[PDB]
Amino acid sequence: AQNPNCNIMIFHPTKEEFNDFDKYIAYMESQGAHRAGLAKIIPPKEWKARETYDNISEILIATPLQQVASGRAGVFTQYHKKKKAMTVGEYRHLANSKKYQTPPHQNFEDLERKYWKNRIYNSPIYGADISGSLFDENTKQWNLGHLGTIQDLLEKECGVVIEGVNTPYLYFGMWKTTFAWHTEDMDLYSINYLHLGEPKTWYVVPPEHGQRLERLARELFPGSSRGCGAFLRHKVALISPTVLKENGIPFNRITQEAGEFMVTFPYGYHAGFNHGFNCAEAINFATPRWIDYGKMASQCSCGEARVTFSMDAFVRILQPERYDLWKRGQD
């Protein structure tokens, strides 16, 4: 069995290897990459996502989210308070202000220490989940707006034609902006490209151990667990590496820098934080190996998780027994 310790693997494809996206994902899996739940892909030196980032300041963040924490430093939830719209140029200036800017620090480890010590005492503002793309249309390799769609993969594997679309999303971050512990919708893959700015630190639980994280979360967030049998789908709970280690949960960590891709694999729980002003682009995708994960994915039916239009068909076709209850939670 390849990668039996479930380490995060880092790949350096050549420009030739970068041509066929599906083929390279299958290659990484042949080497055991999926066992970690996360992999890093460093593009060949010849590749670029677009020519420059000099002209992005006029993008609108219609609903910036202030991420307000409750709990203790290593075990907390966050709620998202909606803020007035602002442009990327206005958001960048805000991220760089004295109130929000990255503190002085020695290295990524020191910054990570400071994040876990101090996150809860601040409320950073995240421009998340913005439909759009920063890849140039002429970028043919690993262009996250030009991937094969999940609806086409389901149709190719299973023969059923379904409605829905699959488009990318932009994320504008600042120091301490936080992504809570989650797997993807329908335990899909994700791919995330850090277009510019400061790094993103990731934490990940191997898919084979995801239920260990779920059981800890039920212990740590007991009211939330009684409210919903899949409350991690709400994407609000944080647990620090120190607490994970105290409770014996297997995990790994890595820092993504600008110009790098990350892939999350089906049922790979992940969480993390931004180091400073940045912009990422991410999208869900599927492969044949996902289908079985999609069939088994948990679902929130309490009403909190509310998701996209296109998840309807995935539930309806892969999980017909769960469909009626889940759809009630959507409505």
Binding residue positions for Fe cation: 182, 184, 270
Build a one-symbol-per-residue string for 198-237: x at contacts with ligand OGA by CB under 6 A, - elsewhere.
--x-------------------------------------
Q: Which residues are documented as binding site? A: 126, 182, 184, 192, 200, 228, 234-235, 270, 300, 302
Build a one-symbol-per-residue string for 302-321: x at contacts with Zn ion by CB under 5 A, - elsewhere.
x-x-----------------
Q: Quickly list H helices, 129-192.
A: 150-158
CA 72 to CA 54: how far, in whole Å? 40
CA 63 to CA 238: how far, in whole Å? 22
54 binds Mg ion (CB under 5 A): no
196 and 279 Cβ atoms separated by less than 8 Å: yes
Which of the listed partners (ligand OGA, Ni ion, Mg ion, none) does 280 bind, with a CB threshold of 5 to 8 Å by partner kind? Answer: ligand OGA
Member of 16, 58, 321, 331 binding Mg ion (CB under 5 A) = 58
Q: What minimum distance in Å lies between the beta carbon of 285 and ligand OGA? A: 11
Q: What minimum distance in Å lies between the beta carbon of 275 and Zn ion? A: 31
252: tokens are 């790994």
Q: 80: how many CB neighbours lie within 10 A of its CB?
A: 16
Member of 76, 115, 172, 179 binding ligand OGA (CB under 6 A) = 179
Breakpoints of the chain, after residues (C–N > 2.5 Å):
none
228 binds Zn ion (CB under 5 A): yes
190 binds ligand OGA (CB under 6 A): yes
At residue 205, φ and ψ (nearest 5 deg) are -105, 130
41: tokens are 């892909």
Q: What minimum distance in Å lies between the beta carbon of 191 and ligand OGA? A: 7
CA 260 to CA 193: how far, in whole Å? 6
61 alpha-carbon distance from chain centroid: 19
Residue 263: how many CA atoms within 13 Å on its side-chain side? 28
115 binds ligand OGA (CB under 6 A): no
Question: With contacts defined by CB under 5 A, how many residues of the chain interact with Mg ion?
Answer: 3
Q: What's the chain's length in residues?
A: 331
Sign of CA dihedral 174, 181, 225, 323: positive
Binding positions for ligand OGA, rule: CB under 6 A: 171, 179, 190, 192, 200, 264, 270, 280, 282
Binding positions for Zn ion, rule: CB under 5 A: 228, 300, 302, 304
Binding positions for Ni ion, rule: CB under 5 A: 190
